[PDB]
Write a protein that binds this DNA or RNA. Sequence first.
DNA 1: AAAAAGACTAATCTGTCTATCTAT
DNA 2: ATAGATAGACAGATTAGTCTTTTT
Lengths: 176, 177
Amino acid sequence: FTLSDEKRNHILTTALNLFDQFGFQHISIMRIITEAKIAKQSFYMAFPSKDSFIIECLDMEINRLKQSLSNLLGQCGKDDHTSILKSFYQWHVDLAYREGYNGTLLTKAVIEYWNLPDIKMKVEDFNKWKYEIFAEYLAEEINNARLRIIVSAMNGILLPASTYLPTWEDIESLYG
Amino acid sequence: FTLSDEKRNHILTTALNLFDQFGFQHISIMRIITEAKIAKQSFYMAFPSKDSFIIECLDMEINRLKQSLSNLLGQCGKDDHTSILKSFYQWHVDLAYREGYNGTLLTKAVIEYWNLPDIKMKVEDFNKWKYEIFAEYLAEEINNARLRIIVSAMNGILLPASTYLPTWEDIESLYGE
DNA sequence: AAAAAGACTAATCTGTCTATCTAT
DNA sequence: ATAGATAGACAGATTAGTCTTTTT
């Protein structure tokens, strides 16, 4: 009748792991219901439809990636512009350089869910946020021409089935 | 027990136009058959299953992307490395600016079919082919640290819901160094 | 015989939604 | 009565193998 946030946040986390491992298509409600040690009726007292459940899962993953990159950049010196560059590269690395990587969860949401314009907007607002939060740290050094190439090159790393990825020493030569 | 190859390409091209705008899991084979104005049994005589049809659809797209890039870089002036880099850049922007872009058809096949290992191999074979055919025309080594950044910046243009696309003058200033 | 159109079916699998059934 | 499990059940679609009729 009123799903507890202990249980409510369990269908979200269980589905997010099932979605990142596989896909939005393969993983069904019945798959998440059993693995989250929950029933089917109580799942609908907090989420009306599956499309609302996918949007809810996307906002949680976007906020997760937001805090993940926010803390990683704040651990370097304000004048150490090279440490911010390496943290930005290693952040895109530990995502793509993982076992069973088939793209980020945000890229999957834009491919399967072109029907809802709010989903592509939610991902676009984060990609713009990732660029602007990275330029906030390095605004007095790297110019906008090189910044757009740095971020676009880092986005090419997140692209699955990509070859000839730019190493850190390759990124080191761009700064100087 | 055999099918006309003219009809074979009609089922293949109809599904490709359906997948590039809607993805693989949205379009069913009953929709592909009804959209191609063909019969349901003629689809199974040529293609044994649905995954065999998808892999055949991926091989046709890669060979299409191969000739499209081989020609665009080939029609450029000989030893005009700047004009080739400009055509290589405008090629990725032309793909990302196509209406209804939710990702490359290769990216969808990789994401939506993680189970089939040969799908991830064919796209990896294409991206490996794309980087090496670019170093050939530029008279540059296959290990140029600049080249690895240029191509990866172009793939970032093909990212779904991308933003802050680098301008041509940005890619020009890199190669100018 | 060859190909090509036409539904059958069947075995399957979901999306919600009903109908209780408790323990609390 | 709240909360949460535990089921089938309506309603669609669905992929693959069957059967019929037909034109070349």
